[PDB]
Amino acid sequence: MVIATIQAEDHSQQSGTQQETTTDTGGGKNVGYIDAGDWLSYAGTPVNIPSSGSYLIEYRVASQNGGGSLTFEEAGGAPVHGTIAIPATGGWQTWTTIQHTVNLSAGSHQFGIKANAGGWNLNWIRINKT
Numbered sequence: 001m002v003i004a005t006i007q008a009e010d011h012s013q014q015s016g017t018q019q020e021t022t023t024d025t026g027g028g029k030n031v032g033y034i035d036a037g038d039w040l041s042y043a044g045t046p047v048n049i050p051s052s053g054s055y056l057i058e059y060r061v062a063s064q065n066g067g068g069s070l071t072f073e074e075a076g077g078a079p080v081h082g083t084i085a086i087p088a089t090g091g092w093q094t095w096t097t098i099q100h101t102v103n104l105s106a107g108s109h110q111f112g113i114k115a116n117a118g119g120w121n122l123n124w125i126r127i128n129k130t
């Protein structure tokens with residue numbers, strides 16, 4: 001069912017953010033200090049999509065005050081796959097998993113995330129079949 005899990009800190013390029021220790025399950029790091037304009041590229045780790053169609057994209061997120069949103073896309077900015085609002089979770093290290101669906105073409109993808117509004121932290125992303 002799982003196509004890929006990508007730890008958010010395992011980006012090949014980024015803008016505007018910093019990693020920090022997470023107390024979420026599994027430990028490790030999350031991406032923090034996210035604001036409008038910031039972005040994360042996973043171009044260095046292309047992900048293979050086996051067939052064209054609907055995929056479920058999950059994000060492990062934390063947000064003290066809510067109000068954030070992101071765009072999931074190809075690295076570089078286009079095509080855009082989808083957008084998602086990031087809810088308040090109650091704290092910077094109070095974690096939850098949110099999800100949406102997007103259409104993806106078959107083949108090798110180089111994904112990216114653009115923050116449209118800040119206020120949240122990101123631990124990992126997961127791409128699943130539907």
Ligand SMILES: OC[C@H]1O[C@@H](O[C@H]2[C@H](O)[C@@H](O)[C@H](O)O[C@@H]2CO)[C@H](O)[C@@H](O)[C@@H]1O
Nearest residue numbers: 013039041043074075076077112113114
């Ligand atoms: O999709 C995220 C973000 O990508 C930015 O382009 C990056 C690209 O992600 C990276 O792999 C490449 O090496 O460098 C360029 C930046 O020069 C793009 O500028 C953003 O608009 C986009 O949101």
Ligand SMILES: [Ca+2]
Nearest residue numbers: 016033034035
């Ligand atoms: Ca920032």
Ligand SMILES: [Ca+2]
Nearest residue numbers: 007008029123
């Ligand atoms: Ca992580």
Ligand SMILES: [Cl-]
Nearest residue numbers: 091092093094
């Ligand atoms: Cl917390």
Ligand SMILES: [Cl-]
Nearest residue numbers: 035036117118
């Ligand atoms: Cl912001």
Ligand code: NA
Nearest residue numbers: 079103104105
């Ligand atoms: Na696509």
